[PDB]
Design a protein around this nucleic acid. Structure first.
Ligand code: MG
Ligand code: MG
Ligand code: MG
Ligand code: MG
Ligand code: MG
Ligand code: MG
Ligand code: MG
Ligand code: MG
Ligand code: MG
Ligand code: MG
Ligand code: MG
Ligand code: MG
Ligand code: MG
Ligand code: ZN
Lengths: 55, 222, 129, 125, 215, 25, 81, 97
RNA sequence: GAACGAAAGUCGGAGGUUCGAAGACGAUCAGAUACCGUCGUAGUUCCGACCAUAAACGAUGCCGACCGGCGAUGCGGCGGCGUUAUUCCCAUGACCCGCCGGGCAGCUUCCGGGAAACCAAAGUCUUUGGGUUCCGGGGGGAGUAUGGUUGCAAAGCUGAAAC
RNA sequence: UUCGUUAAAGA
């Protein structure tokens, strides 16, 4: 879920450590994000039932 | 170029173009909530200055935790100025928060004369006061072309307020800007709260903008 | 014990104005107090007032307006010559156009505006605005 | 052991709020109903949510729930509202309370129909 | 005037609900509403000065333009029953139960309204809308008692807000006068249903007992 | 050191210096 | 506010209170503009004509508004005899 | 600053209160300041009441009591679990149930 | 300038139960001469004289006026076919409701103050003035030295400066 | 029941 990069920057003061972490969004269809939903997230549906009871 | 995201009904009257001036809002003392309202009413009110960004601490077991306390004084030179205080862990975030809170805490400034009624008011109408902490700030009317004889921070605040000529008398810790600028703010806020002898008659009691344009608010709410 | 009854009246006037009442009960009566309230009536800061004439000492009831900001009595009643009123102008009155100071002229209880026309001057009872 | 997470209880409350008639009082059926109507990847989380759903079903079968109410209980509360008999809206035309309100009806002009004479001591408070 | 005067059916319903009796403690702004003390502690509120404040509350509510700009709040169950059948009937927007303090102040919550008038039941049980009036600039009508504070209150109707029958009678007759001012019901026309909805209903023990006794 | 016992020891020193003055006037 | 030329120079004339004749401030958020409408004859028809009672913040906090509305409408003749 | 309005004791009209000795530490404390309670104890422990009732001469015709003016000071009562410390909003309270 | 002025202390007369400055021991601690225990002197007790100090506190000068409410309390006064007390209408006693005056106080409050704690006064103060008295000018030196004065004494009042 | 003290800065 979290792309993490640890890189170095060489300046006149010495070295500088940069750490960039990015959490990816959930995309099931496509290569943009992962296909696995989050275990803390619970997906529900919309209500379905409608009119016409007995007669 | 962003949508105003319609809310709070006052800016919805503004976007329906029903309140023609901010004077009509200060007639009825309605609570302003978002900072876009006076940006819509005033375009030349962007003249501001950050006064002092000072660090405050909070002692924690891991160590002292800092956060910066920014003061921003805004105001157009026609007599609508405001003050904003915001403490936040980031410099530019605290500056933007103090700008937005100053846009919220803008007040009108009443301008009077020294005693000759020619025109173009240049001073406070009477000797007013303001208190914050122990800081008693007295604003005294001045003759024409006198200037602002004060500390540089309320000198800049009155220069934004449009009071070109004033005398000041400060008692207390003047060294703390977080009380001295707010005492100057209370002193310039009490200028309309003073009972002045050119308001004898009963006022017109004009209609509320809610009463005048209820049906537009009904058709935009439902 | 009981002295400066004009200040004793104006403290009640001031507390009733700060509270926001309608009319004040004032236990002393002086011709000083009657002429002082007459000057305040003529300027229109206060309204109609009725003096219950007791056999010992009456009681003044003043119908307030909701108009007064501050009224008081200078304590020792300083002896003020002309060309010295401008000190009290800069000291007491909140502006040049507003407020008045009750002078005790030789021809009667007069006003700050009336004294410069009468050309008398004198002592000071108090100030009101 | 059943000290379940707020997101678990919130998901189960969303289930019992939206779909009530699809749920019963059996765990092995309610789990399959909840996995037909919702998406939960973890089977332990399935069992947890379905167990708290059965617990909420056993609570609703006994009495009402302060947290959420179904449409059938809403219609029952509306029925208990608008079930209006005519028994105690207005009483019979014999009312006596006070000699003070007797004096009120004497001075301020109204009916003053019934008699009003009661004496009470001063043992108030 | 001359049609806004109380009648025999009105005073019969007031004496039937028993709103003439109030609390035992006094207030410094209820002296003009009380008439005379009575033994056993219970004090007597007059009816004409209650009718006049009910009339002014009805004038205030009918003076609104949008009926959604009037909010009706009660926190206790003797008033929560009356609010939902009151405000949804004619001219207001109800809210009861927990007030969620901070409702009319912040705008991040979807439960935010801008009411131009407020009617509350008990000031001591609804101190929080009285506190939040000072940031919204709304008037306040409160069914006050002889021992209730009068801070941030514009119209005070002296009554007994403890008994549910007096509360339901006041909400009923307030909506009655609001509808006769708006023009739904004429002056020579009685109301169609008896107000027990507005009063109270005891839940399913004696309610189902009375139903089984009636069937 | 307490102000009480500081004042009492300065009092004792005052008594000692007074006895020194009375011993060698 | 007027000058010798007679121009209206002041920005806004604030609401003078109907209780204590005090100027309502621009930041006085505890103020209120009460509105009560007029009532017609025996037929009892609602009018669009109304009267405004300005009550300020300190009066509303002290509780003088309850006495003040009735003692102001008594001079009108609309609350009582 | 002043921690309390009463300044510990209840001397408000007078100027001197005669001290009464404490129970544990035996320290003279004025009686408007000392913890002055009234313990009412049965002289027999509640499990020995049945034993003395079975071994009594009379058939339950005597029930003795024990009334003692217990008089602690505030230095020993906090150590002896009576007048435990409270909050700033909790110092405005009355006698506990 | 004058009269009282807790405790302790001083000078006479009487007595001395308890407690108990100092003191003598017994303990614990590296060490106690201290907190703990045993005994016990001056004192603590009374009548005469002196000293005039304290956290002598409301750490808050005195007199007068104004400015919200509530429930109680102490003392008088007033009103109430109420109850209980003698023999019985006639008077005082005890309880219940309300008002008045001054008194010790309690709770809430955006009346206003103040740095806040908090305060119906510590409010009516830059919108600065009712009458009057004594005291503070950064902290130490120091309430110290030298003067003067009171006291039998311990000491008290007034009171610096160098640094 | 007994159980003392840890220089100076340096965030
Ligand atoms: Mg400094
Ligand atoms: Mg401390
Ligand atoms: Mg004492
Ligand atoms: Mg002595
Ligand atoms: Mg002796
Ligand atoms: Mg010993
Ligand atoms: Mg011994
Ligand atoms: Mg000796
Ligand atoms: Mg001293
Ligand atoms: Mg003195
Ligand atoms: Mg009595
Ligand atoms: Mg007697
Ligand atoms: Mg060492
Ligand atoms: Zn003890």
């Amino acid at each position: 879920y979290v792309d993490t990069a640890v890189r170095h920057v060489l300046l006149r003061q010495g070295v500088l450590g940069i750490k960039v972490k990015i959490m990816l969004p959930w995309d099931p269809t496509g290569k943009i994000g992962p296909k696995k939903p989050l275990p803390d997230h619970v997906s529900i549906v919309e209500p379905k039932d409608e009119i016409l009871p007995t007669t | 170029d962003k949508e105003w995201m319609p809310v709070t009904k006052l800016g919805r009257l503004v976007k329906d173009m029903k309140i023609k001036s901010l004077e009509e809002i200060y007639l009825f003392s309605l609570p302003i909530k978002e900072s876009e309202i006076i940006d819509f009413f005033l375009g030349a009110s962007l003249k501001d200055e950050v006064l002092k960004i000072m660090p405050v601490q909070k002692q924690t077991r891991a160590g002292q935790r800092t956060r910066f306390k920014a003061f921003v004084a805004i105001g157009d030179y026609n007599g609508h100025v405001g003050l904003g205080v915001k403490c936040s862990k980031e410099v530019a975030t605290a500056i933007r928060g103090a700008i937005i809170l100053a846009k919220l805490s803008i007040v009108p400034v009443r301008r009077g004369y020294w005693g000759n009624k020619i025109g173009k008011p240049h001073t406070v109408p009477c000797k007013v006061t303001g208190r914050c902490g122990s800081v008693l700030v007295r604003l005294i009317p001045a003759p024409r072309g006198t200037g602002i004889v004060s500390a540089p921070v309320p000198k800049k605040l009155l220069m934004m307020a449009g009071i070109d000529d004033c005398y000041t008398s400060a008692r207390g810790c003047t060294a703390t800007l977080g009380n001295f600028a707010k005492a100057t703010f209370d002193a310039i806020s009490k200028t309309y709260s003073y009972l002045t002898p050119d308001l004898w008659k009963e006022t017109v009691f004009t209609k509320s903008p809610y009463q005048e344009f209820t049906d537009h608010l009904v058709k935009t709410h439902t | 014990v009981r002295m400066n009854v004009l200040a004793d009246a104006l403290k009640s006037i001031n507390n009733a104005e700060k509270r926001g009442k309608r009319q004040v009960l004032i236990r002393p009566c002086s011709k000083v107090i009657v002429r002082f309230l007459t000057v305040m009536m003529k300027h229109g800061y206060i309204g109609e007032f009725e003096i219950i004439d007791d056999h010992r000492a009456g009681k003044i009831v003043v119908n307030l307006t909701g108009r007064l900001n501050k009224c008081g009595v200078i304590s020792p009643r300083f002896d003020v010559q002309l060309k010295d009123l401008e000190k009290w102008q800069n000291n007491l009155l909140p502006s040049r156009q507003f407020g008045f100071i009750v002078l005790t002229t030789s021809a009667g209880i007069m006003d700050h505006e009336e004294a410069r026309r009468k050309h008398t001057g004198g002592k000071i009872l108090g100030f009101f605005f | 052991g059943r000290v379940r997470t707020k997101t678990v209880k919130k998901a189960a409350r969303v289930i019992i709020e939206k779909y009530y008639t699809r749920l019963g009082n059996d765990f092995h059926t309610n789990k399959r109903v909840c996995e037909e109507i919702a998406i939960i990847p973890s089977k332990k989380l399935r069992n947890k949510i379905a167990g708290y759903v059965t617990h909420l079903m056993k609570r609703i079968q006994r009495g009402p729930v302060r947290g959420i109410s179904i449409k059938l209980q809403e219609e029952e509360r509306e029925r208990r509202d608008n079930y209006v008999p005519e028994v105690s809206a207005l009483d019979q035309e014999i009312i006596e309370v006070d000699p003070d309100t007797k004096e009120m009806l004497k001075l301020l002009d109204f009916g003053s129909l019934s008699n009003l004479q009661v004496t009470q001591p001063t043992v108030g408070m | 005037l001359d049609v806004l005067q109380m009648k025999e059916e009105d005073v019969l319903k007031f004496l039937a609900a028993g709103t003439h009796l109030g609390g035992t403690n006094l207030d410094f702004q209820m002296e003009q509403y009380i008439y005379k003390r009575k033994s056993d502690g219970i004090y007597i509120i007059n009816l004409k000065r209650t009718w006049e404040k009910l009339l002014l509350a009805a004038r205030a509510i009918v003076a609104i333009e949008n009926p959604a700009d009037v909010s009706v709040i009660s926190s206790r169950n003797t008033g929560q029953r009356a609010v939902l059948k009151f405000a949804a009937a004619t001219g207001a927007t109800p809210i009861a139960g927990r007030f969620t303090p901070g409702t009319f102040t912040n705008q991040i919550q979807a439960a935010f309204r801008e009411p131009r008038l407020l009617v509350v039941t008990d000031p001591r049980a609804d101190h929080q809308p009285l506190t939040e009036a000072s940031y919204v600039n709304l008037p306040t009508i409160a069914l006050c008692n002889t021992d209730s504070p009068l801070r941030y209150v514009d119209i005070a109707i002296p009554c007994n807000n403890k008994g549910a029958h007096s509360v339901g009678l006041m909400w009923w007759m307030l909506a009655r006068e609001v509808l006769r001012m708006r023009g739904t019901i004429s002056r020579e026309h009685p109301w169609e249903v008896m107000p027990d909805l507005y009063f109270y209903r005891d839940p399913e023990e004696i309610e189902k007992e009375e139903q089984a006794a009636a069937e | 050191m307490r102000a009480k016992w500081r004042k009492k020891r300065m009092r004792r020193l005052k008594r000692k210096r007074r006895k020194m003055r009375q011993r060698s006037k | 506010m007027q000058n010798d030329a007679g121009e209206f120079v002041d920005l806004y004339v604030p609401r003078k209170c109907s209780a204590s004749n005090r100027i309502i401030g621009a930041k006085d958020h505890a103020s209120i503009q009460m509105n009560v409408a007029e009532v017609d004859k025996v037929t009892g028809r609602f009018n669009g004509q109304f009267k405004t009672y300005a009550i300020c913040g300190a009066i509303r906090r002290m509780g003088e508004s309850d006495d003040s509305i009735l003692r102001l409408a008594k001079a009108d003749g609309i609350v009582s005899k | 600053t002043k921690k309390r309005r009463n300044n510990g004791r209840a001397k408000k009209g007078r100027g001197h209160v005669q001290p009464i000795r404490c129970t544990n530490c035996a320290r003279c404390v004025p009686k408007d300041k000392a913890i002055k309670k009234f313990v009412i104890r049965n002289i027999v422990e509640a499990a020995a009441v049945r034993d003395i009732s079975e071994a009594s001469v009379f058939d339950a015709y005597v029930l003795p009591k024990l009334y003692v003016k217990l008089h602690y000071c505030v230095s020993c009562a906090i150590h002896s679990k009576v007048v435990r410390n409270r909050s700033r909003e909790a110092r405005k309270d009355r006698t506990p149930p």
